[PDB]
């Protein structure tokens, strides 16, 4: 029968945010939280895949002293044509005995290549993504880890401490309603639907599954005329739109998606998208709470800062002399927004001094710090750092 604390932190991975647990009649607590990963897993649906195509040309039917006739069969892009006035030459001489009435029947068609099992591109329908996240919590001085759905519907019971996360403040996904995936990369593309592929373009040949025996394809296959005295089947045909797309694709979402999203395939997922914010519900059990009577209450505390430097990191060092009531753990919180403290919990025993760190951006820092029961003031001057550019949030 504990208490339910609620807070809101920006959905930014690697930024430690401090909250102040305030239970009536109990010593305050300084919870540090650091989001580790945020998974955006969209529900997908397969439309079709595309691959390099294979032009099948069986041996021509050279009918000597006669005329052949075509028969339009049901093969993808079946291309038949009869040719007159031929005198085919094999090295041993003339195949056809007659001087006239020689015909060559040329057939061809298109099917999936033998390489369509490894080199392929999957065209999917992405909609209504699903979320998941992972967070580090500094509670009881312990770095604990939580993993749940980032929607606020399912809770994690970790050491009798219930944790609820969600829903996402943003319903964003760098994946459009229609996407394409090639084996290591995700692309946004309004791909031509099944039955609308154009020659030279993406998916000049299409198949719902890599195994489905029947496929759809039009590659503008037209048979030319064979050169005189020669047995061959020349064609004109739009080349593979796949290999064209392989050169012509451009960078994937791993390099171009906004908000610094990370893109990973199998499953198609987006990680660490710094968008919106996220709520956190912590139902702390009542057992670990401790009243003020049992809590060390510090009195007659002083603050001193020998050196400080305003920057993104904890560029200031502080030391607090105190007179604690007894030996035990206690918390260290910063009441003000513009000032943050690296420390959250230190050990107090009688009279001693403690060493902590703090961070802000201004030169002259004036703020108050409370140690586990009582406040005190700290003031100093902070220099600028040597770095204008920093490689951490």
């Amino acid at each position: 029968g504990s208490y339910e604390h609620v807070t809101v932190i920006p959905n930014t991975v690697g930024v430690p945010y401090k909250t102040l647990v305030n239970r009536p009649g109990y010593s305050p607590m300084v919870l540090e939280m650091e989001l580790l990963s945020v998974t955006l897993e969209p529900t997908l649906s397969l439309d079709y895949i595309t691959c390099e195509y294979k032009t099948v040309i069986p041996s021509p039917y050279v009918k000597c002293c006669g005329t052949a006739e075509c028969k339009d069969k049901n093969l993808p892009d079946y291309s038949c044509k009869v040719f007159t006035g031929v005198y085919p030459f094999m090295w041993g001489g003339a195949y056809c005995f007659c001087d006239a009435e020689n015909t060559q029947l040329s057939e061809a068609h298109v099917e999936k290549s033998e390489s369509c099992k490894t080199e392929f591109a999957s065209a999917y329908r992405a909609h209504t993504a699903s979320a998941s996240a992972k967070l580090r919590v500094l509670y009881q001085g312990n770095n604990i880890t939580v993993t749940a759905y980032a929607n606020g519907d399912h809770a994690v019971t970790v050491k009798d401490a219930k944790f609820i996360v969600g829903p996402m403040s943003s319903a964003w996904t760098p994946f459009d309603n229609k996407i394409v995936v090639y084996k290591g990369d995700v692309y946004n593309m309004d791909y031509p639907p099944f039955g609308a592929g154009r020659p030279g373009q993406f998916g000049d040949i299409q198949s719902r599954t890599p195994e489905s025996k029947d496929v759809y394809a039009n590659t503008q296959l037209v048979l030319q005329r064979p050169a005189a005295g020669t047995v061959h089947v020349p064609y004109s045909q739009a080349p593979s739109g796949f290999k064209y797309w392989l050169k012509e694709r451009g960078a994937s979402l791993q390099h171009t998606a906004p908000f610094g999203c990370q893109i990973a395939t199998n499953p198609v997922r987006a990680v660490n998208c710094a968008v919106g914010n996220m709520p956190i519900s912590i139902d702390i059990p009542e057992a670990a709470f401790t009243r003020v009577v049992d809590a060390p209450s510090l009195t007659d505390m002083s603050c001193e800062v020998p050196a400080c430097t305003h920057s993104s990191d904890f560029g200031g060092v502080a030391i607090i002399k105190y007179a604690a009531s007894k030996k035990g753990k206690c918390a260290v919180h910063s009441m003000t927004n513009a000032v943050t403290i690296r420390e959250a919990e230190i050990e107090v025993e009688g009279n001693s001094q403690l060493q902590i760190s703090f961070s802000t951006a201004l030169a002259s820092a004036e703020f108050r710090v409370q140690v586990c029961s009582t406040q005190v003031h700290c003031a100093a001057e902070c220099h600028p750092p040597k770095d204008h550019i920093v490689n951490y949030p």
Binding site: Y61, K183, P258, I389
Partner: protein, 393 residues
């Protein structure tokens, strides 16, 4: 219990009635049996069982043979009937391994035995051995061959616009066939390198495995056409005389009497001259690639059989270089990077705001570039190195 059909009967495909040594017993009958069952699912069972002969000894190349086909550039410009003619070139491998298919058979002697130091071509009626060591493939520089078996050659060709395949036959006279082929393998990753470096990064790719295990891919084969040869006819001073030379000959004469026929022995047509007659050599005992460069046997219908082929496609790992660390200098909302590329290296940077304004450029030489560092964030991808992150203080 998978059944195959003869013409009126059914039987298990793995146990035909001609067992054992089906081919050696009756060649023509065994091939027709395979042809009639080409569409049935247990065909490849029938093939493994009706071609092996032990005293496994399954050697498919007893039924196939090399052949002559048309080649456009046999060297010195003109076109010739080449015994090393090409059929198709495959460049689906991401590493650039070419899978070349030619009209000779590597690794098989005329007696159908397996031997890697030999290959069999066709010499105007009769296959003949030749030294494998004399085979070569080159585009602009000689290609390093990685595998040879049957009709198929794996090679590593350098950047080139043509492709030549040739060997040296029995009589130490060279044969060669040259086709146009735009060979420039696609670049893996984000840098254009030429020989895998030391430290690098491991990226996915596709290559042609160097094993000769016949598992997945297949080609089509059928009986050869009636092959002509002008040497068969002779002039017995008023008439025509033909010689079979251990084969069967289909002759046709433009005179009286039995002006045509299929003779197994030497025959003579009277009241005729040579120019009125024309004869070819039938051979229903071997198979041949269903090639557009070779006509189809007219008398038989669309009889066809299929045989597996070596060197399938399989995805493996290629290793690419990581570009060296650039020189970094800082400034107010500015990062100055001096890049030292040893080869064409791709550079990309995206802001972590809602408008990333992704910019990329193929950095070629040493260049000092200056990038704005907005408060939202900046991600710099340099070659295949892990993404740099830069923020303002």
């Amino acid at each position: 219990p998978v059944m195959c059909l003869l013409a009126n009967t059914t039987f298990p495909c793995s146990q035909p009635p001609c067992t054992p040594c089906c081919y050696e017993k009756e060649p023509e009958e065994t091939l027709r049996m395979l042809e009639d069952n080409v569409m049935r699912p247990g065909y490849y069972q029938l093939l493994q069982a009706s071609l092996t002969c032990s005293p496994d000894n399954f050697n498919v190349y007893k039924a196939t043979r090399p052949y002559l086909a048309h080649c456009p550039d046999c060297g010195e410009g003109h076109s010739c009937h080449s015994p090393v003619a090409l059929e198709r070139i495959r460049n689906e491998a991401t590493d650039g391994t070419l899978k070349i298919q030619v009209s000779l058979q590597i690794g098989i002697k005329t007696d159908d035995s397996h031997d890697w130091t030999k290959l069999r071509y066709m010499d105007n009626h009769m296959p003949a051995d030749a030294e494998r060591a004399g085979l070569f493939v080159r585009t602009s520089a000689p290609c390093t061959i990685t595998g040879t078996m049957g009709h198929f050659i794996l090679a590593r060709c350098p950047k080139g616009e043509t492709l030549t395949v040739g060997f040296t036959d029995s009589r130490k006279i060279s044969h060669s066939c040259t086709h146009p082929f735009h060979h420039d393998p696609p670049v893996i990753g984000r840098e254009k390198f030429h020989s895998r470096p030391q430290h690098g990064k491991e990226l996915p790719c596709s290559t042609y495995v160097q094993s000769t295990a016949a598992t997945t891919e297949e080609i089509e084969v059928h009986m050869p056409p009636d092959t002509p040869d002008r040497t068969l006819m002779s002039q017995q001073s008023g008439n025509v005389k033909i010689t079979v030379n251990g084969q069967t000959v289909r002759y046709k004469c433009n005179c009286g009497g039995s002006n045509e026929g299929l003779t197994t022995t030497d025959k003579v047509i009277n009241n005729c001259k040579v120019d009125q007659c024309h004869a070819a050599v039938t051979n229903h005992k071997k198979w041949q690639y269903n090639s557009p460069l070779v006509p189809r046997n007219a008398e038989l219908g669309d009889r066809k059989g299929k045989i597996h082929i070596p060197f399938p496609l399989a995805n493996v790992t290629c290793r690419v270089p990581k570009a060296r660390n650039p020189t970094v200098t800082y400034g107010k909302n500015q990062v100055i990077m001096l890049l030292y590329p040893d080869h064409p290296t791709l550079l990309s940077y995206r802001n972590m705001g809602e408008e990333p304004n992704y910019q990329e450029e193929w950095v070629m030489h040493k260049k000092e570039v200056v990038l704005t560092v907005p408060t939202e964030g900046l991600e710099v991808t340099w070659g295949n190195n892990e993404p740099y992150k830069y923020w303002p203080q």
